[PDB]
Amino acid sequence: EVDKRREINNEHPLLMMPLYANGEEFNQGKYTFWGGDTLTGKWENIPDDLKPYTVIQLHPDDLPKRDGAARDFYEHMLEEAAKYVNPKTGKNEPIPVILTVYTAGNMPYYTSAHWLSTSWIDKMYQKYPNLHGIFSTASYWIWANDIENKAADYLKVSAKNGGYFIWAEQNVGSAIEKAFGKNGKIAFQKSVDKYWKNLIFMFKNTPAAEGNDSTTESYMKGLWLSNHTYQWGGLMDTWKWYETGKWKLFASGNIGKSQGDRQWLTEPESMLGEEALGVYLNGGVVYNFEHPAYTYGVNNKESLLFSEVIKEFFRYVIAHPAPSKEKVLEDTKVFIHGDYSNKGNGKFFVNVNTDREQTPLYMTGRYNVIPAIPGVLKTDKLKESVSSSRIQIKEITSPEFSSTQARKEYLNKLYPMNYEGDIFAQKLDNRWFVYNYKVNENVKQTGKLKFNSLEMNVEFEPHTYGIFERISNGLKVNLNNFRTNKDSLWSNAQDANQAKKLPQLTKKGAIKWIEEHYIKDTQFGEKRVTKIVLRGIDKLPTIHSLSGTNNSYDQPSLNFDQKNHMVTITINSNGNLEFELHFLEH
Ligand SMILES: CC(=O)N[C@@H]1[C@@H](O)[C@H](O[C@@H]2O[C@H](CO)[C@H](O)[C@H](O[C@H]3O[C@H](CO)[C@H](O)[C@H](O)[C@H]3NC(C)=O)[C@H]2O[C@@H]2O[C@@H](C)[C@@H](O)[C@@H](O)[C@@H]2O)[C@@H](CO)O[C@H]1O
Numbered sequence: 001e002v003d004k005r006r007e008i009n010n011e012h013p014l015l016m017m018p019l020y021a022n023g024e025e026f027n028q029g030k031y032t033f034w035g036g037d038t039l040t041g042k043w044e045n046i047p048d049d050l051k052p053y054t055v056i057q058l059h060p061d062d063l064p065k066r067d068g069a070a071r072d073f074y075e076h077m078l079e080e081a082a083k084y085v086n087p088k089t090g091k092n093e094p095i096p097v098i099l100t101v102y103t104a105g106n107m108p109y110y111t112s113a114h115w116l117s118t119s120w121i122d123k124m125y126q127k128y129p130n131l132h133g134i135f136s137t138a139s140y141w142i143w144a145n146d147i148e149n150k151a152a153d154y155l156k157v158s159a160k161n162g163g164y165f166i167w168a169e170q171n172v173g174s175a176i177e178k179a180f181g182k183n184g185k186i187a188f189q190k191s192v193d194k195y196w197k198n199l200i201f202m203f204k205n206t207p208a209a210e211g212n213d214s215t216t217e218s219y220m221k222g223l224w225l226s227n228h229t230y231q232w233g234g235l236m237d238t239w240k241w242y243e244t245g246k247w248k249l250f251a252s253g254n255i256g257k258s259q260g261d262r263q264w265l266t267e268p269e270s271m272l273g274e275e276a277l278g279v280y281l282n283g284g285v286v287y288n289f290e291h292p293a294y295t296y297g298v299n300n301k302e303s304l305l306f307s308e309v310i311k312e313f314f315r316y317v318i319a320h321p322a323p324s325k326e327k328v329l330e331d332t333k334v335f336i337h338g339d340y341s342n343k344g345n346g347k348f349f350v351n352v353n354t355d356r357e358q359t360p361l362y363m364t365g366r367y368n369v370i371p372a373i374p375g376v377l378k379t380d381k382l383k384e385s386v387s388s389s390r391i392q393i394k395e396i397t398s399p400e401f402s403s404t405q406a407r408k409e410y411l412n413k414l415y416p417m418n419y420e421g422d423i424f425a426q427k428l429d430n431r432w433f434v435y436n437y438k439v440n441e442n443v444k445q446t447g448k449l450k451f452n453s454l455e456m457n458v459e460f461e462p463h464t465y466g467i468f469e470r471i472s473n474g475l476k477v478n479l480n481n482f483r484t485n486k487d488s489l490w491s492n493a494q495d496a497n498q499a500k501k502l503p504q505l506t507k508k509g510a511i512k513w514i515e516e517h518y519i520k521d522t523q524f525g526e527k528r529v530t531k532i533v534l535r536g537i538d539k540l541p542t543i544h545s546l547s548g549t550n551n552s553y554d555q556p557s558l559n560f561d562q563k564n565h566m567v568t569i570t571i572n573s574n575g576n577l578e579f580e581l582h583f584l585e586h
Contacts, residue, residue: 001197002162005132006055006096008200008231009285010321015050015314016057016098016135016166016235016288017042017296021073023062023112031076034061035293035511039080041300043095044087050311053318055132056081057288059100063112070112071120074099078128094130098166101154102136105144118153125161133164137235138204140172148179152191159195168202168235168288171216174341177374180228182339189376192228200286201229205275208240211346211357215372218349221282222336222371225329227381233286236275236360238267238294244358248487250442253496261505262490264291265513268463268483269305273313274435275360277465280317281426281433282369283328287314293514301519308482308549308576316467316478323428328371329387333414336372337379338396352407355437363437365426367415372396421447423460434458435465454585455535461528468532474541474582479530482549482575485523489513525574527554532569534583541567541583549575 008014019039022032032038039056046054058077060070081095101121104110125131134154139147151167158165169175174182181189192199201223203216220232242263245254249266272295276287287310289295295310297303302311323331340348346357349370355363362369373379379393392414394400400410419425423445424437436445442462449456451470458466464481493499505513517523534541540560552575559568565586571577 002160004164004198005129005162006164008164010283010324013053013285013314013317013322014233014287015054016286017046017054018057018059018288018290018292020059020061020292021063023064023069026063026069026073031073034507035298035514037298037300039077039095040084043084045300045302047311049318050314053314055096055098057098057100057135060112065108065110065112065114067115070116074116074124078124078131081130082128094128096130096132097128098133098135099124099131100135100137102150103138105139105142105147106150107142107144110142118157121154122157122160125157125163131163133166133200134158135166135168137168138206140170140175140204140207143173143175143178148181148185148188151179152187155188155191155195155199159198162198164198164200164230166200166202166286168204169216170204170207170210171212171219171340171345172207172210174339176216176219177339177341177376180374181376182374196228197230199229201232202286202288203234204237205234205360206237206239206243206290208243208358208360209245212340213360214346214349214354214362214369215340217278217282218336218340218370218372219374220284221328221369222373224283225325225332225335225371225382226373226377226379228373228377231285233284233288234275234279235288235290236272237290238272239264239290240360241267246440247496247499248490248493250440251490251496253499255496255500258500259502259505261507261510262502265294265489265510266486269309270463270465270480270482271361271439272305273309273480274437274463274465276310276313277433277435278360278362278369280322281365281428283323283325285317285322293511294518298511298514298519303514303518304482304484304522309480312480312576326387329385329391331368332371332388332391334367334370334411335379335382335391335393336370336396336401337377337393338372338375340372340396343396343401348401348407351404352411356439359437359439361435361437361439362424363422365424365433366417367411368426370411419447419449421445423447423458425449430470432456432468433465434460434468436460436462438462453536457531457533457535459529459531461530464530466530471580474580475534476580477532477578479571479573479577480575481528481530481573482552483525484518485525488517488523524552527552527572527574530571530573532571533566534569534581535564535566536585537565537567538584538586541581544580544582546579548573548577553577
């Protein structure tokens with residue numbers, strides 16, 4: 001083992017910061033990114049507390065599809081990254097970089113990344129200590145004949161240099177299963193046997209119409225727990241709204257894949273946090289997002305989605321490290337071995353812990369995420385772990401997995417019901433994590449959670465998550481329901497058919513819209529009500545350390561009922577919010 005260039009784990013999570021090459025301007029002799037971010041400007045704008053946990057991910061996007069283009073662009077930016085001087089201290093502080101080296105099967109008709117040899121990658125690793133890793137993303141839909149052989153080389157050249165190979169992929173057409181050798185292409189399987197400590201595997205939830213969210217995330221978690229990857233994460237993509245044909249929030253009708261650039265703007269901001277919770281709560285530590293202009297920002301400025309949701313969520317996972325592999329293994333009661341492709345893919349979990357075929361969310365935390373590995377792999381390194389002796393390792397073909405009903409009946413015996421109400425809730429140590437799991441339906445949800453004898457009832461509108469921590473002097477609360485009004489994008493269309501026929505916003509038009517109507521002159525959503533009821537309380541609680549998105553919340557209202565020893569907390573907000581309540585139990 002060569003010394004790793006960086007740590008990636010629960011205590012050192014990783015936020016990837018994508019910068020997409022502008023190929024049109026490249027043809028004009030410029031070195032720029034779509035959305036107007038600069039490498040240096042973006043890095044400088046990253047908050048100093050986040051800098052140790054964030055890496056700039058270069059992507060070749062629409063660079064010319066010919067030899068030399070991607071190399072020329074990448075060498076230019078690695079030079080900029082390497083020579084960076086911190087203006088406050090005057091010291092050279094090389095900016096850490098990940099290069100996107102593989103995507104779209106590296107077909108010469110799809111990407112300039114085709115003309116990046118492993119020899120060149122090796123050269124850049126040796127030249128640039130700030131090159132921390134290389135990234136393969138989104139070939140599920142174009143599974144090239146030598147993809148597994150090429151992934152083996154990427155992992156090996158990374159290991160050789162102490163860098164990470166990062167692969168984001170979704171289980172469309174058995175991609176994850178094939179990667180590990182299902183169809184007999186075993187090169188990457190063998191590479192992983194030697195070099196897994198340098199591999200990061202991530203889901204990529206983009207192809208949402210295929211509904212592989214639950215099954216891909218289950219693999220990512222199981223690969224990690226069984227030592228087939230060093231850590232895991234997910235790329236969470238607002239393009240899912242396009243893939244599934246949604247339009248105006250809560251509107252009826254499906255428009256199909258007809259308004260791409262309006263559609264990738266429409267996913268509620270807070271829903272990205274709901275998606276990211278599934279990574280964190282299950283020991284994942286790597287985060288990435290598309291579309292970058294919405295999820296991160298433009299012109300070296302943070303979008304409100306980034307500042308109010310993603311940034312604050314990432315700060316949370318740094319302050320409260322995700323459960324360790326040891327911890328997750330200890331809590332795991334069932335571990336699946338086999339191919340989800342043989343068992344209905346995402347349908348496997350529908351009405352088990354997901355409410356529908358096409359969703360990135362869960363409807364219960366009762367089983368958290370059941371971890372799995374493809375049938376091609378062995379559970380040897382899993383059983384070698386000391387923390388894994390209480391786990392039932394089960395073939396996916398077992399009768400307990402044969403139907404929806406059999407799955408719940410089997411899992412219910414091993415995972416006890418630990419809350420009430422039709423809402424998503426999961427508990428870690430002294431913390432309840434809660435969200436409303438509705439995607440595009442305006443329906444409130446309620447739950448009853450307990451901290452021993454203390455009862456907490458909550459009422460959540462859609463696109464609202466909360467983290468409730470029992471501390472010695474009371475309850476720490478994090479709430480996020482940030483959701484701006486996107487209706488303007490869908491102006492002039494009263495129904496789905498009409499929305500289909502709107503003029504294309506276009507990629508450049510959407511970037512412009514962000515600049516003109518999201519970065520500034522934002523159409524904020526209306527404040528909306530969250531209720532929290534605590535039963536078993538001695539006196540009216542006091543509120544402390546209240547803060548949140550500027551101008552986004554009314555002062556919380558507390559109504560204490562001495563006779564019933566209970567308080568009703570009414571919050572009216574639209575944003576990120578945190579406070580503590582101080583009280584004693586009765
Ligand atoms: C040949 C073909 O059409 N291939 C499709 C893939 O490109 C799709 O991958 C992503 O799908 C999105 C739609 O769900 C979208 O097209 C996205 O690209 C657009 O957005 C990104 C930033 O998010 C860039 O701005 C791209 O320039 C822009 N492209 C277009 C034409 O609008 C696709 O993601 C990109 O491409 C893939 C291959 C990876 O390289 C990603 O890292 C890129 O961001 C796929 C969806 O399942 O569908 C294929 O048919």
